[model samples]
Target: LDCKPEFSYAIAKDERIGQLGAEGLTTTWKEYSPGMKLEDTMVIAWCEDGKLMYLQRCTRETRYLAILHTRALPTSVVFKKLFDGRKQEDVVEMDDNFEFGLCPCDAKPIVRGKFNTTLLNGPAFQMVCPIGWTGTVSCTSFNMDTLATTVVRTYRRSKPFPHRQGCITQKNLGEDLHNCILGGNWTCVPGDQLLYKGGSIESCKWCGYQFKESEGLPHYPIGKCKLENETGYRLVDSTSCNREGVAIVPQGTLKCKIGKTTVQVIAMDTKLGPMPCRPYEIISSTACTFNYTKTLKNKYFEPRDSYFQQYMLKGEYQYWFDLE
Candidate 1:
């Protein structure tokens, strides 16, 4: 009988099909192996660029029939010839589908000034920034195996805070500044005499004035307040109390006034721990759908298993086997 025009001519020239090809590649089709074995194995054999590409499937069960009357030989041969003539067109179509579905491999980074603002939006893929690069970045996309590269949104050294001002309030002040002029909670002591926990009497004094609570005027401590027990409200002026002492402010939250902006920091440590912002702050973000593309790295197309070993058997659009 004459074959169809679409594949009849090339089928005769194809070298990877026919009873000999099937027998040569079907040595262990029914033999037992280590892994889970299927009841039967279905194979799809095709040739591409001088190589024999054999795929197999064993999803459904079946009984071996008359070998002499089988049409698998002619069918594989016809399919192989048809694929060879139209491989380029198929490849182009596949490339377009995958390239549009997957994120770009060479994504660009975002750049901005110290305080400049920029919108952070891109493909629904992971975002990453260079080492030592400051600023904020976010991503809204994820996958089971992996996601695309992260987006680079902002870049600067300044830390993000709730707002400016009120950073040095009494609640957040450190130990040293617990009682000073700026502490807003310093007790007034009368005389220059000061006592420590032990019998030692150090002239521990700072330069400040003590005020009387007259007309709602609060008093401030000059030197370290004398111990609670030992004290006298002497009007000791600079002459009596040494004027050489300087106020020692404790280290605590820092206050910075720059560019007409007053910023206060409660902590100097830069390690803010975990993500302070959402994974992505994109003005426009959408759930992404990915397409699986065939490549040389794919085991289904590039088999590492011997001919007798079980391998995947996938059709052009259908999944037919799990040859174990």
Candidate 2:
């Protein structure tokens, strides 16, 4: 209940529980009994935050990840699950169409429909729903639950109707497989290039690698054998230089110059800040222009690629193996 956008970002508007000199309260706290897991069918919060972000709980981890913004028009809603809610405006906030406490997109009993779930303090304030939508509020409270691990969280969570882009390893069976871009000749065939997991926006799906059962979970990031150069040197995939290992390489014995190019390493920070793909699912290049060029006054990566973008890994830049 205490988390707010201001807690993390320097530019976010200051807000709290109806206090003076504050933007407003982000969320209100309530305490209602679990009441013996009834068939009432309510969106249980798996995650909640001040900037108006919630995520429907998941296994390896989550399903919905909503971001409700006061500025977005009520009519401007798109019902795809696992959506994004962000803007380039360095202005007042970090509100992406990211999530809403209540979403009209989801008609099913679950999938975290509401994005902007405001807990009312003034009992006098009226409660209502949108047209064709029933307004219902409950004496909802918090409860305790455990994730796949022992990590227990008492936080509120979830997003709206999910239409997230995802992938499952072709190591199994199925079609719709697409080449997951990587820095080497390596390959990954996902079951479906885009898997819809309701109520969340999955920005990137990383290609993985693991030969044995002893290794940790396979989350190895694979780019299209590309990199802007990790540091001051150029390094490509071992196979990318599989040829004469000769083409173009700057002379240096620092690491044995076989091929000359920026070695694609785990992208931490590109010179361009962060690659916009994670936010690319919902953000347009034009919108990107406004945020990147106008907002930051930096060169915009015009003509950006689709969800499968790979150029960001060029010299002096970055990209997500899938996500942060």
Candidate 3:
């Protein structure tokens, strides 16, 4: 076989053959053949750059001299399966146990005993069995040199393993059922209220015309009903005063009075700036609990809520909804 040509680019430290980088060399030119189809395997590639061309190759072993460089020193290694060569520092690279490479938790052949107990990754639990291990083992204590002091968490059969009948949880109606609303009223049952879906038999005056659900009031409305007095004007427009003639409104109406307090107002700012971010901030934060406080800090003094003049030390300034 002909000796491989030297690569024209610089190989990054801890670089993989399958990944792309540097002098445009990609996975198209190189290949990662670990040969092992088992889970939790790693691909260790030895890359070297030079003035000639790109060259790469993967190996089961991590020992390799930096061939292209004068020093020719070994950098990093990759593992095909869980071996005793890994250090605990590899787990610290990512918090929340987010691992990019394969884990060497176990490499043992599990054997089925009384309860069909088997080891998952070799002698991970030297004394105990694996996930599916059901049989009883005669081992007095678990002892695994690879795991060292971490063997205290080995799974073992203990008494008081309560056995239950059928599933304890009630029959599931649906995930979205919690958000649904129930309605209806029974006159004969006095305090007892009845629940009925869809339209009712007749409009109950005590139940306010029809017991139909009132659609959520809108943030703003197109037009408003006004009850004017002798002076400037006083508008007492009920919420949702449209269509059906049943004082019911769609999503686009104010909940309370629709029209303005005073009909004759010449100056109203036609255009307002974009809504300020109302993200709340936290006062104290920890690994488990977080305390948050919301406040109001007007970005524009001229267009802010005059009632909310006070300022807060921490948290965020939530903007008020405009119901014009």
* TM-scores, each model vs. reference: 0.15, 0.14, 0.17
lDDT of 3 by residue, 1-324 (tens): 011343121223233433222221221222222221111123233323211222122122222111222223223212122112232221112122111222233322223243322333333333221221222222122347665333111122332122122212111132101111111111011122222232222211110121212222232211222112211111112333332222222332112221211111111122322212222233543234433334222122123333345322232233332222
Once fitted onto the true fold, the runs of candidate 2 whose alpha carbons sit more than 4 angstroms away are 1-99, 102-160, 163-324
**What local distance difference test score does each model get?**
0.25, 0.23, 0.24
lDDT of 3 at 228: 22
RMSD of 1: 39.9
Q: What tens-digit string does per-residue lDDT give for candidate 2 at 1-324?
A: 322331111111122313232232122322222221111012233223212233332212212212233344322222212323332211111122222233221211121223222323332121121111112332222335633222211112222221112322223223122322221112231222333222222121222211211111122221112212211111112223111221212332111110121211132222343222122222223222321111111212334544446334434222323322
Stretches of candidate 1 exceeding 4 Å from the true structure = 1-134, 140-142, 147-149, 155-175, 178-220, 224-324
Q: How accurate is candidate 3 locally (lDDT)?
A: 0.24
Clash counts for the predictions, in order:
7, 56, 16
Best by TM-score: 3
